[PDB]
Structure formats: C-alpha cells, structure tokens
Amino acid sequence: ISSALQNLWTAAQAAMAAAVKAKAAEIAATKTPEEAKKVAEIAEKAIEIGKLAADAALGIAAAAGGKAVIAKMADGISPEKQAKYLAKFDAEAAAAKEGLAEAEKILKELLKEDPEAAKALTATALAAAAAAIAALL
C-alpha cells in the first residue's frame, strides 16, 4: 500500500545514515576519543542535512510534475481550478525550499565547527541522498 512506499523511504534513509556513520568511523579512527565525539555529532547533523536535501528534491520534482500535468489539462479544467492547484503546488515547492534553507543553516554551522569533517560527512550524506533519490525515481 502506501505502507511499502514508506518502508522503502525509511530503509533508504537508514542506508544514508549508515553511509554517513561509516565515513564518521573512518574520520574518528584518526582522532582522539574527545575529538571523535565531536565527529559523531557532526555526523548526526550531516545525516539530517542529507534527509532534508532528499525531501526537498522530491518535493520540488513532485511540484514541477504536478504543474506540468496541469499545463496539459489546459482547457480540460477551469482557470479557477487551474489556479487552485498551481498554488497548492507552489506552496509545495516553497516548503521544499524551506527545507533546503534549513540544510544550509546546519551546513554553515558545521563548517564553523570543523570544516574538513563537515565537508567530508556532508558530501557522503548528499551522495547517499542522490543515490536514494535516483533509486526511487
């Protein structure tokens, strides 16, 4: 049902987090335990960045697809309903861009905490997110 789709998305997010944590273990192995704890916290925030970016990309793509669907159902539907659903979809895209802004907010502080670990963990998170987004679509 929608059950299995949510199970798929849950498992994809779990794979993303597992990739980020594997990279985090690689980084922490060359650090003191006291700095490795910091690496772990940066890894958690990078996992969050990856989830946000994936959700935002999916929302933007769904909104664009819906607006294209309305642009074919041209005079098949009244201009009033056209505007109704084009707006609903613009709000959908706006929420996705809000998620992107929050991801940027987190990335800027992670760069203010440890730029090299932030860069590596966020690159791993975004790559796992791209792989999941492509696998779903």
Residue numbers in the entry: 5 to 141
Reproduce text from the manuscript describing this model.
Pathogenic E. coli and Shigella spp. produce the outer membrane transporter ChuA, which binds host hemoglobin and extracts its heme cofactor, before importing heme into the cell. TBDTs consist of a 22-stranded transmembrane β-barrel with a pore occluded by a globular plug domain, which is transiently displaced during import.
We expressed and purified four binders with the most prominent inhibition zones (A10, C8, G7 and H3). All binders inhibited αβHb and Mb-dependent growth of E. coliΔTBDT:ChuOP when spotted on agar, to a concentration of 250-500 nM for αβHb and 125-250 nM for Mb. To resolve how closely their computational design matches reality, we attempted to determine the crystal structures of A10, C8, G7 and H3 in isolation. Diffracting crystals were only obtained for binder C8, and the structure was solved at 2.46 Å. The crystal contained eight molecules per asymmetric unit, which have a pairwise similar RMSD of ~0.6 Å.
